[PDB]
Symmetry: D2
Subunit: 295 residues, 4 copies
């Protein structure tokens, strides 16, 4: 037997950082969960019990906190690139670092219509994520994403004209509920190293904001023919607005809300145009994916 692939590190490292403006007294908080996995010349830890090649996972944990103390933690594309580069520069035998960051929302409170200097609310479990792969001699690959964005529209969704055969019971419809949790990922052009990531720092927050805005507006305004057709419109617009993105990937569950026939009870009308009360289905769910790139 031989080691074909190996990676190891520390997962679920919770980090909070506060920034304190001395002039204004305004405080800004950042909270993330970080995972770092390393690869390189480490096969002998597996095959020969040679721990000399192991950077302890405990040390990786320490490194994350020290890196967050000495560097900006925002945008997360930059922090992830700094953290990944650290490992491949510090350790001769480590050739790749894989950094995953989940950013948690701490939104400044408005009290009596003014922004509060040091109070925050978690407005939704929506996350902003990055995946940074730093590979010796192959630069920095960044995938940025938003996840956990849960939306519903109560009309202006259709689904008709699909394949009908002896397995099909689904009725065509010209008016349904559409609800999903949005997972959207945009993959940047490969960066040569940290200097090039730093040169594009302003684009990261701006592209996240664009991706979010395009997703919400397209969902709200499209007279949707299908999840497939609406999601492609979202992806097309993101690629048009940021030339440094190579691909956009969406993964959307179709969270079903079923009509309830109440006609057995005193002829109560609750289907088609009369539908008011619906049964949200926990499972099963549709799952629709696509990856959109340039011509």
């Amino acid at each position: 037997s031989a080691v074909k692939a190996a990676r190891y590190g520390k997962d679920n490292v919770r980090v909070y950082k506060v920034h304190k403006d001395e002039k204004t007294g305004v405080q800004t908080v950042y909270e993330m969960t970080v995972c770092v996995l390393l690869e390189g010349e480490i096969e002998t830890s597996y095959t020969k019990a040679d721990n000399s090649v192991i950077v302890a996972t405990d040390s990786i944990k320490n490194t994350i906190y020290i890196t967050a103390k000495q560097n900006p933690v925002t945008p997360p594309e930059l922090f992830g690139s700094i953290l990944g580069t650290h490992f491949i520069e510090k350790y001769n035998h480590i050739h790749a670092a894989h950094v995953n960051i989940v950013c948690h929302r701490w939104t400044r409170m408005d009290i009596d219509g003014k922004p509060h200097p040091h109070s925050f609310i978690r407005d939704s479990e929506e996350k902003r994520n990055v995946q940074v792969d730093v590979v010796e001699g192959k630069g920095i690959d960044i995938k940025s994403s938003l996840s956990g964005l849960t939306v519903l529209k109560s009309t202006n969704s259709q689904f008709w004209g699909f394949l009908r055969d002896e397995y099909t019971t689904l009725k065509e419809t010209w008016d349904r509920i559409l609800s999903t949790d949005v997972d959207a990922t945009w993959q940047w052009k490969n960066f040569s190293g940290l200097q090039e990531v730093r040169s594009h720092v302003p684009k990261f927050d701006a592209t996240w904001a664009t991706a979010r805005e395009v997703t919400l507006k397209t969902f709200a305004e499209d007279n949707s023919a299908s999840v497939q057709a609406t999601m492609y419109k979202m992806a097309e617009q993101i690629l048009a607005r940021q030339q440094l993105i190579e691909t956009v990937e969406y993964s959307l569950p179709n969270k079903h809300y079923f009509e309830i026939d109440l006609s057995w009870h005193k002829g109560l009308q609750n289907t088609g145009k009369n539908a008011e009360v619906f049964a949200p289905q926990s499972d099963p769910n549709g799952l629709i994916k696509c990856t959109v790139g340039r011509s």
Copy 2:
């Protein structure tokens, strides 16, 4: 052996309702999870296999959907009172109905600064809940609550002057992070029946909004001496603003964020006034409760 207490019914009943304004084209959605448990003269179903006294849990489920079709589902205090009253009026041998409603957020989307007519976002897992106990000859007891409201302040929290003995390691502090998930419950005066609940319908949404606003403003503005002292200030203000509330109960976890001593690494200063990077603790957590009533 004897049956001392028995209750049965249906839990986890997901319900969606849409309201469609024909004039404006504006649609409003409501989504809840409902539990109904019944009590009454049902001991023989347990002791003698006498199913004739059982209103099937499946029928309770049907009743929830039929009730939501024929009545307003907001405010939830009213819907719960209608649903509970139905069971004790329809079934001679059922003497109490216990209704629990969890309301899920569907917040109308703003697209290009205008409210969208039929598109919604789940802005946070905060819930609005009711517990309604309808008891034949004892009226309607309503407990209203908000839960899942997660906040953090990065300064203006202290904790000093506590009991110190041979079990104590905790250092006194004049500046810490305070973070909690708020669970707040206000218990209404007993209502004689549905007519009296209907007479107070406007107070329900208004009192929920007051409870929320008082909680957020007090948290943000109090130079907190302890969770105990801040929560009592919240409860005192709610009781002052709504005379029909008898008691206010708060249950607050103290979600700890620990300083990280980095002085072992090149004398890096990250404690006391120099603290920037902290380790959020998943567990354990403080848990602080109190119930506040009138003199």
Copy 3:
């Protein structure tokens, strides 16, 4: 406003203890999650910012570990009674301690048919729990429970003869699937103090084992007329086998498995006697409770 009720302490305190037999080399592990809440003369911490009455929740955490170091942690009824008694004896102004323990399974591994001296498996998320209330001048109240015991029987469950009215769609059945998660609680006679709890130590593990065995055998062997009727048979037998129990409470969800009509597809027969494939329902669920005590 006045404080009507207050309690505070530490939740989610994870504890592991190992016992090492020096003679045999056999090691035994215990892992629990502990919550301690205190009550007493503490209102001024809420009303006056008087922290002098607060035993810090951090100190409660330390006390749990010190108590586990110096005492047996099994049976959990005994450990909980020791921990609760500590607080009301050590602190003059603390008059009640509320201890909740969840015990996690670590079952010794069998390797090549022999018990392994120091290796363990988590065989199921079933828990053994205690609730201990130690109240100055009112002794020690213990509720023991098992929870998370998930079972299914594929036949020998019926449900017919229930109330039928204009809300009823459910068909009577003489053969269905019955599946539940068992939550069973037995409440001990009040104990005068720690000496009396110690005098009954052997009864705690024995009664837990009896409750488990009665639950499994009754579920498996009863030709069930309803969840109500089967659960009462369980409770009756536990009360008959342990005279120091006052009450037995069961809380059982009815986790539904629905027949799937496939007759639309090439007349495939999958209902009634021909039913082979079923759709497990995540929600809603029936919820059936009862408390059984002595004549």
Copy 4:
């Protein structure tokens, strides 16, 4: 913009099947969660709102139940291969089917030392999984796995001799707790089609049992030098016992249990050889992966 990749289908499809032996009266239950995603000539559903190429996800759901009615559901490698092959044979424009099955434990109850004919218990959240990729003209790729197998050993784990630098605080140890959740995947040789999968049916359950037994025995008996070294020993033995496996992948969290220094309290000794009480850490955790193949 162009569609680079697309797949869609139905997730979270819960299925139960019962087998009834007419001779013995013995019943055997199977419960799984199934996901099917399709790929093929479907880009126009995304780009042109052409639903004619869409096999509705609702129809995929129906197909899963019909397939389970007409075929064995065990071993899951066989059921997954039948289900995937169905789609690429029935639909000219579908060229790949991706089937994921999670099998849930329903273990027959022993009542009074005899196996019960129709009663089952969920003994642990351990799963048996398959991933089946059926690709027109490229055969059937099967990955089998077990997941959710949670173990702990209280001694006979070491970790010393790792890299020490200015980021390192971790002390070397010759005696620690090792606890993990095992995720183990074995990848079969490519199969030409369903006839070849059928020819190897007995190997699937046997290889699952071997993988489980090797994992448990190696964990229990290895005087572990590291997670890395123990996991490689597991992988080496599976590859030696089943020639039709190409690779074995393990993913192991290192769930930390920390010593608690109690020496501040009356000089209590609870570290090194005196350690009895430990604090289980929820996060962070080590994460160690490797893929082992043949020379």
